[PDB]
């Protein structure tokens, strides 16, 4: 049968608004091998994005790790959004960081 | 450390298939293939180990021969062996030393058949099929016997000049950076403490969050994740009430800082204070 991706977002470093940085996106446990990954940037998608050469685990499931240089503001929201034949619909997880404290 | 190939190969129809083929040094590749051009590439300067182009030449045209020859092996035999479009075909292949040696093959993600020292074993849940694919495979003997040497002379033999001239790189140290947040989805009166810990080599690490000297076992350790610059990435959460959050830090321990530990602590405006 089929196995459905587990996607996990990070950065390399911490967050800083107006420092070069880059956001991954690491897809894996999926079966079969055909995948659709994008990363986000404002719900709209982004265009030089690299990924890995596609590899598996003992298990024989699928992984995969998308990646692209960005600089951040304080404006941005960042995602990454797959699909696959077990998704009923693009699933869409975000790049979770601080915005500091809201009350000046 | 076990040196291995990979081989994916994915049948969308009669007429419409992918091929990839990639070697691996545990976590870290080290060779890709190129379908145009037919050609190996090597990913280091040191995946080519002591080994001569007039013996890359051949390896490369062995295994385009194989490759394309598994090619249309498959297709024709696919309905005596009852494989049904779209199927993926996957193989892994290597050795481990101090002594080892394997070759696997997986139909449609699970165990199918593997080489035991001099021919292709069904696996026993994979029924009849298999045995009737190994029969295929086992139709030429001297196709096996190339087989063994190649796990039993060849990989041993590469997995030399590989690690030696690859040690500089296997063996660096990068020293670990990190940085705390807040988590997502904390339960009600409740908050999660996110410790990220990322760019460090090799893999093997140590966070833990701490009231002073005592490791807070509500940690929770995620997988840890890769970079293209080849480092790890690690978050490791806390979830606590919502006062209770002083004096809370993150501890980090890694090879390549000589027991200078990282610690971080929930403080300023993470709190946050007056
Ligand atoms: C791992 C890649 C393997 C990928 C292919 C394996 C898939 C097999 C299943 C598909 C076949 C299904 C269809 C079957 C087709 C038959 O098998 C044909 C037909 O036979 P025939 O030619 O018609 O006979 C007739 C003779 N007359 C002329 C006299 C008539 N036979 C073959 O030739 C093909 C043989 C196929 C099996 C070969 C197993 C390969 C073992 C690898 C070991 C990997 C570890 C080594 C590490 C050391 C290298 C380290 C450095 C290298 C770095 C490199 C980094 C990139």
Same mark, same amino acid.
């Given at each position: 049968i /089929? !196995?459905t991706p587990?996607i996990?977002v990070?950065?390399?470093?911490?967050?800083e608004?107006g420092?070069?940085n880059?956001?991954? =996106?690491?897809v894996?446990? *999926?079966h079969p091998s055909d995948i659709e990954?994008d990363?986000?940037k404002?719900?709209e998608?982004?265009?030089?994005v690299?990924?890995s050469?596609?590899?598996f685990?003992?298990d024989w499931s699928f992984?995969?790790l998308?990646?692209?240089?960005? @600089?951040?503001?304080e404006?941005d &929201?960042?995602?990454?959004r %797959?699909?696959?034949?077990?998704?009923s619909?693009p699933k869409?997880?975000?790049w979770?960081?601080? +915005?500091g404290?809201?009350?000046? | 450390?076990?040196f291995? %190939?990979?081989?994916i190969?994915?049948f969308?129809?009669?007429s419409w298939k992918?091929?990839?083929?990639?070697?691996?040094?545990?976590?870290?590749? @080290?060779? @890709?293939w190129d379908?145009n051009?037919?050609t190996?590439?090597?990913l280091?300067?040191?995946?080519?180990?002591n080994?001569?182009?007039e013996?890359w030449?051949e390896? &490369?045209?062995l295994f385009?021969? !194989?490759?394309?020859?598994?090619?249309?092996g498959?297709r024709?035999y696919?309905?005596?062996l009852?494989?049904?479009?779209?199927?993926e075909?996957?193989?892994?292949?290597? =050795?481990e030393?101090?002594?080892?040696?394997?070759?696997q093959?997986a139909?449609?993600?699970?165990?199918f058949?593997s080489? /035991?020292?001099?021919?292709?074993?069904?696996?026993?849940?994979?029924?009849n +099929?298999?045995?009737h694919?190994c029969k295929?495979?086992? /139709?030429?003997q001297?196709?096996?016997?190339?087989?063994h040497?190649l796990?039993?002379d060849?990989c041993?033999? *590469?997995?030399?000049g590989l690690?030696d001239?690859?040690?500089?790189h296997l063996?660096?140290?990068?020293?670990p950076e #990190?940085?705390?947040?807040?988590?997502?989805?904390?339960?009600?009166?409740?908050?999660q403490?996110?410790?990220?810990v990322?760019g460090?080599?090799?893999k093997?690490?140590w966070? +833990?969050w701490m !009231?002073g000297?005592q490791?807070?076992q509500?940690?929770?350790?995620?997988?840890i994740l890769?970079?293209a610059?080849?480092?790890?990435?690690?978050?490791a959460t806390l979830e606590?009430? #919502?006062?209770?959050?002083?004096?809370?830090? =993150?501890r980090?321990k890694h090879?390549?800082?000589?027991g200078?530990?990282i610690?971080?602590?929930w403080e300023?405006?993470?709190?946050?204070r007056?």
């Amino acid at each position: 049968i /089929q !196995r459905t991706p587990k996607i996990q977002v990070y950065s390399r470093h911490p967050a800083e608004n107006g420092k070069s940085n880059f956001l991954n =996106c690491y897809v894996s446990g *999926f079966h079969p091998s055909d995948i659709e990954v994008d990363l986000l940037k404002n719900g709209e998608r982004i265009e030089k994005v690299e990924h890995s050469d596609l590899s598996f685990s003992k298990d024989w499931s699928f992984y995969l790790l998308y990646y692209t240089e960005f @600089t951040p503001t304080e404006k941005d &929201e960042y995602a990454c959004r %797959v699909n696959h034949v077990t998704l009923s619909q693009p699933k869409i997880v975000k790049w979770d960081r601080d +915005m500091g404290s809201l009350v000046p | 450390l076990s040196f291995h %190939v990979i081989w994916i190969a994915s049948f969308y129809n009669h007429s419409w298939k992918q091929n990839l083929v990639s070697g691996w040094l545990s976590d870290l590749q @080290t060779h @890709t293939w190129d379908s145009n051009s037919s050609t190996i590439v090597f990913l280091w300067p040191w995946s080519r180990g002591n080994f001569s182009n007039e013996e890359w030449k051949e390896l &490369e045209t062995l295994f385009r021969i !194989r490759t394309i020859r598994s090619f249309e092996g498959i297709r024709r035999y696919a309905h005596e062996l009852q494989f049904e479009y779209p199927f993926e075909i996957q193989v892994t292949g290597g =050795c481990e030393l101090h002594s080892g040696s394997f070759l696997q093959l997986a139909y449609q993600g699970s165990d199918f058949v593997s080489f /035991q020292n001099n021919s292709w074993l069904p696996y026993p849940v994979a029924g009849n +099929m298999a045995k009737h694919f190994c029969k295929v495979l086992n /139709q030429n003997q001297h196709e096996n016997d190339i087989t063994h040497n190649l796990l039993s002379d060849t990989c041993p033999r *590469f997995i030399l000049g590989l690690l030696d001239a690859g040690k500089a790189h296997l063996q660096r140290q990068v020293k670990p950076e #990190a940085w705390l947040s807040h988590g997502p989805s904390p339960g009600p009166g409740h908050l999660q403490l996110v410790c990220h810990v990322s760019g460090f080599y090799p893999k093997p690490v140590w966070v +833990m969050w701490m !009231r002073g000297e005592q490791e807070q076992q509500g940690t929770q350790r995620g997988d840890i994740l890769p970079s293209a610059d080849g480092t790890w990435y690690l978050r490791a959460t806390l979830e606590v009430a #919502a006062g209770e959050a002083a004096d809370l830090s =993150c501890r980090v321990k890694h090879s390549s800082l000589e027991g200078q530990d990282i610690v971080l602590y929930w403080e300023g405006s993470l709190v946050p204070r007056g």
